[PDB]
């Protein structure tokens, strides 16, 4: 019934769905060496949000709640609240609170707090290690590493704003963060539940197409490559449109509006990811005004022209 489409937006006008930064480019490469199962930026073409995906880009990798000081340390435990400061419910059928980081690494940001009675405020440099034993957002607690042992107050609204990533602690250069490794959302040695499924190309000569950003680095030599399956704007658009899918695969053409010509074609799968016909790692060279255009509902019988 309602016709499907994708937004008229260039890549650079769009946003990464896994960290609050702009998209920069398009990348394709082989994905057999790893499990591709991000939980943010997961949405069906008819607008069903999956994993930990929520609508606003500014909520990705942010936390809210109140903090409890861990005595003898510059470390704090946040008892999480939902985005509107209401109670967080650990029984909900989601892997973690919506917007929870979906990769193992060290995220640096700032913890800010306001005291309710007099409106006095404070902020401090803060780091969350999503691979730590105490990263348990699904259970409603995460631990922050800070530069104060004294300044934060108990029972007061506290927020973490993410900035970038770091590499430290003797790890290898560019071997952290690990964008395709999911955190253990309930903490050390726990199983994740309710995941959006892993994705892979099935057809031979076919590869995923990634929407790529470079995360800001705050310290060391981190791997700042961040790939998402869908731009956050597509997530928001598909949720708004809720257009029924007429097949498993939507044929998209990447078009240069300056010439009207088609740069390449690709498949947007209904369950929410994109594939192309290419073999090997490749940085796509695209015109600045280029954008994706939905041309037809197709199936496996249609073969993508080589990208």
């Amino acid at each position, epitope marked *: 019934s309602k016709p499907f489409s994708v937004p008229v937006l260039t890549v650079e006008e769009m946003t990464n769905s896994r960290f609050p930064i702009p998209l920069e480019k398009l990348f394709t490469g082989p994905s057999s060496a790893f499990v591709v199962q991000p939980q943010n930026g997961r949405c069906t073409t008819d607008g069903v949000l999956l994993g930990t995906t929520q609508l606003s880009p500014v909520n990705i990798c942010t936390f809210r709640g109140d903090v409890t000081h861990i005595t003898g340390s510059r470390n704090y435990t946040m008892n999480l609240a939902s985005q509107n400061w209401n109670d967080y419910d650990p029984t909900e059928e989601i892997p973690a609170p919506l917007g929870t980081p979906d990769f193992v690494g060290k995220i640096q940001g700032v913890l800010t707090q306001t005291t309710r009675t007099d409106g006095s405020t404070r902020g401090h440099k803060a780091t969350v290690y999503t691979g730590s034993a105490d990263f348990a957002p699904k259970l409603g607690r995460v631990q922050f590493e800070t530069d104060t042992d004294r300044d934060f107050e108990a029972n007061q609204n506290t927020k973490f704003t993410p900035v970038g990533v770091i590499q430290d602690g003797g790890t290898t250069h560019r071997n952290e963060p690990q964008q395709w490794v999911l955190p253990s959302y309930s903490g050390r040695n726990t199983h994740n539940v309710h995941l959006a499924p892993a994705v892979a190309p099935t057809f031979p000569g076919e590869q995923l197409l990634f929407f790529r950003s470079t995360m800001p680095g705050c310290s060391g030599y981190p791997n700042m490559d961040l790939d998402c399956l869908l731009p956050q704007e597509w997530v928001q658009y598909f949720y708004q449109e809720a257009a029924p899918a007429q097949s498993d695969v939507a044929l998209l053409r990447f078009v240069n509006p300056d010439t009207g010509r088609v740069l390449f074609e690709c498949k947007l799968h209904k369950s929410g990811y994109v594939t192309v016909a290419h073999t090997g790692q490749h940085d796509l060279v695209i015109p600045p005004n280029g954008y994706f255009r939905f041309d037809s509902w197709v199936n496996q*019988f*249609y*073969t993508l022209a080589p990208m």
Partner: nanobody, 120 residues
Framework: DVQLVESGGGLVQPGGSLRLSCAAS????????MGWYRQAPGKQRELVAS???????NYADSVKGRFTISGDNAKNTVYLQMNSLKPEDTAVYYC??????????????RGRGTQVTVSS
């Protein structure tokens, strides 16, 4: 509705060449894929070659390097050039087409089929 008119099949010497063609008319769409399936007695139906309007092609491994598919858009036709034919290529070859729309599910059409017999 869409109908396909097939031609080009018949008797052929082992190691000989054949050329099939399939022409589509009716409610055809600008985005489509067309190709040939073949069916041999007691064997599962097999895709032989297909071509898509974007230019992408797909071949069965068994016919790779022997068979070539190509298309003429103006004529709405596809051609299958079968070379170095073998007794195992003997089957009924039927043309298949899917028409694709931005507004509807894929619409399939199939030809009546043409016998191909590779024997001396």
């Amino acid at each position: 509705d869409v109908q396909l008119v097939e031609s080009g099949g018949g008797l052929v010497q082992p190691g000989g060449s054949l050329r099939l063609s399939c022409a589509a008319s009716g409610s055809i769409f600008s985005i489509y894929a067309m190709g040939w399936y073949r069916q041999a007695p007691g064997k599962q139906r097999e895709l032989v070659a297909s071509i898509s309007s974007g230019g992408g092609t797909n071949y069965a491994d068994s016919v790779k390097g022997r068979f070539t598919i190509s298309g003429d858009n103006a004529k709405n036709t596809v051609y299958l050039q079968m070379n170095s034919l073998k007794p195992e290529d003997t089957a009924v070859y039927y043309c298949k087409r899917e028409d694709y729309s931005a507004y509807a599910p894929p619409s399939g059409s199939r030809g009546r089929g043409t016998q191909v017999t590779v024997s001396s």
